[PDB]
Structures are given as structure tokens and as C-alpha cells.
Amino acid sequence: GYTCGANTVPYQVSLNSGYHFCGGSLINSQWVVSAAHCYKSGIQVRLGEDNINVVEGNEQFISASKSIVHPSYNSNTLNNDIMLIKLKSAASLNSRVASISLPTSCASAGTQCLISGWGNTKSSGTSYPDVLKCLKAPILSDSSCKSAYPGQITSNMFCAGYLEGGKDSCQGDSGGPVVCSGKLQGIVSWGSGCAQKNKPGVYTKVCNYVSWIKQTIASN
Amino acid sequence: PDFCLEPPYTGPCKARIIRYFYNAKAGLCQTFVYGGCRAKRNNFKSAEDCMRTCGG
Numbered sequence: 001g002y003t004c005g006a007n008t009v010p011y012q013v014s015l016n017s018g019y020h021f022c023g024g025s026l027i028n029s030q031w032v033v034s035a036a037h038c039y040k041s042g043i044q045v046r047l048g049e050d051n052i053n054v055v056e057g058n059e060q061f062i063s064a065s066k067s068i069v070h071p072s073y074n075s076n077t078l079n080n081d082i083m084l085i086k087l088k089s090a091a092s093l094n095s096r097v098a099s100i101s102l103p104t105s106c107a108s109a110g111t112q113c114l115i116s117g118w119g120n121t122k123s124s125g126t127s128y129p130d131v132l133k134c135l136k137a138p139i140l141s142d143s144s145c146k147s148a149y150p151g152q153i154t155s156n157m158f159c160a161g162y163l164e165g166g167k168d169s170c171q172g173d174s175g176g177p178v179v180c181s182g183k184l185q186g187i188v189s190w191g192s193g194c195a196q197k198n199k200p201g202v203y204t205k206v207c208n209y210v211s212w213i214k215q216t217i218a219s220n
Numbered sequence: 221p222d223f224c225l226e227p228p229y230t231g232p233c234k235a236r237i238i239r240y241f242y243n244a245k246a247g248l249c250q251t252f253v254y255g256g257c258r259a260k261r262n263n264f265k266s267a268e269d270c271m272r273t274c275g276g
């Protein structure tokens with residue numbers, strides 16, 4: 001991880017319920033994409049954040065109207081770990097709040113991506129940042145993902161990161177983006193701990209859902 | 221309740237949701253970080269729920 005820099009990931013959202021519990025991505029003025037296991041009541045979306053603990057004057061805090069978990073989310077296998085959030089009011093898109101394009105195709109192994117979040121910064125230990133953290137990590141091959149996690153990887157998941165360890169997404173990062181060449185290819189989802197050797201992070205494969213997201217946004 | 225003695229389980233998912241668990245050693249309900257999935261039973265949404273079910 002590193003400090004992204006103020007308002008440098010403009011599509012990054014914090015999900016707040018009295019405190020930061022998850023991340024998300026702005027896909028348009030009124031819709032956020034996040035993880036299904038981030039579903040809570042009383043979600044407030046905070047846009048334009050950097051330091052989630054102080055008010056820096058670029059924020060928009062907007063409550064959620066609707067929160068739509070994928071009809072086939074399996075709580076147990078974590079398959080279809082995707083949820084949409086409709087904002088009560090449309091956001092004002094500016095330079096510090098902008099949305100992320102949805103992919104036309106799926107990204108191949110070895111694509112380097114940006115993963116961002118306010119989650120834990122210690123592999124083992126505890127340290128929650130004030131500011132946004134970023135991490136450049138490659139998409140891993142299906143073959144290696146399935147061998148890292150035998151019998152747990154569905155066609156809707158991918159692995160990303162480093163087999164060596166020390167560089168990963170951690171608790172607090174869920175629902176947050178994995179953006180590869182400007183396109184939203186993943187959502188931070190799960191892993192066996194974090195930044196452990198031979199256990200990369202596991203991400204929801206957003207390219208499989210593009211039709212669902214569009215039609216759902218359209219009819220809600 | 222036997223599950224009330226069990227250690228807090230964050231699990232594999234990466235959310236940062238504050239929940240409660242019974243801490244036998246301290247004789248009270250304490251907060252921990254729950255990752256958002258595969259919860260075990262020593263995991264409550266309020267102290268009051270925790271105390272009602274576990275407080276012994």
C-alpha cells in the first residue's frame with residue numbers, strides 16, 4: 001500500500017454506518033457498486049473523501065434509497081458477491097467525485113490494477129488509516145487462483161496480488177474497486193487472512209455482471 | 221452456552237463491521253471486527269443481544 005493522494009481515486013466511496021465499514025465504486029450520479037456482504041441498513045454513502053475522520057470540504061454525504069444484493073448471492077460460498085446502492089439524491093459529479101466505467105471485456109492474468117481502500121494496513125496487527133490507500137496488483141491466473149484456494153473459486157471470482165505476501169487488501173477494503181486500465185474489473189471480497197504467502201486476495205469478477213448492473217440500474 | 225466461550229471470528233471477508241462477542245475471561249461483552257461473512261454464533265449486533273444470550 002501507499003497513500004493514493006487526495007481525491008485521486010474519485011470513484012471511491014466510503015460506506016458509513018456511524019463509522020467506515022466498507023468501500024464502493026461510483027458507477028453514475030445515483031448508483032454505487034459494492035459487495036453483497038457489505039449490505040447493512042442505514043447506509044450513508046460518503047463521496048469526495050480522503051481523510052474519513054475529518055471534514056475537508058469536498059465531501060458529499062448522501063444516504064441510500066435502495067440497496068440491491070445480487071439475487072443469487074450465496075452467503076456461504078460468496079458467489080455473486082455484488083450489490084448496487086441507489087443514492088437518495090444524485091451526487092454532483094466534479095473533479096473529486098467522478099464515476100468509473102464498467103468493462104466491455106474481462107481482464108486477462110497479468111493485467112496490473114489499482115486497488116484502493118481505508119482498510120487495515122498491517123498484515124498481522126491493526127492499523128486503520130485516516131487517508132486513502134492504494135495498491136497496484138496483477139490479476140492472477142485462474143489456474144493459480146484455484147490452486148491457492150481449492151474448491152472455492154467460482155467463474156465469478158478472480159485472484160489478484162502477490163504469492164509472496166505483504167501486499168494485499170484487508171478488512172475495511174471490501175466493496176472497494178479493482179480498476180484495470182480505467183475499467184472496474186473487480187470488487188474487494190475475501191481472502192485467507194491478508195497479505196499471507198500463497199493466499200492472494202479474492203475479487204468479484206465484475207465483467208460477468210455488466211448486463212445485470214445496467215438493467216438493474218435502469219429499472220430501479 | 222458453549223458457543224459463548226469460543227474466540228471471536230473475523231472470517232475471510234474484508235468488511236470492517238464492529239460486532240460483539242462474549243469474553244468469558246472478562247465476564248463481559250466486547251467489540252471485535254467482523255469481516256462480513258461466515259459469522260460464528262459468538263457474534264452479536266449489540267451488547268444487549270450479547271448479554272442476553274451469553275451473559276453468564
Ligand SMILES: CC[C@H](C)[C@H](N)C(=O)N[C@H](C(=O)O)C(C)C
Pocket residue numbers: 001002115116117118119120121122123133134135166167168169170173194195
Ligand atoms: C487496498 C488498500 C490497502 C493497500 C490495504 N488496506 C493495505 O494497506 N494493505 C497492506 C499492504 O501494504 O498491502 C497490508 C500489508 C495488507
Ligand SMILES: [Hg+2]
Pocket residue numbers: 120122123124169170171193194195
Ligand atoms: Hg489483514
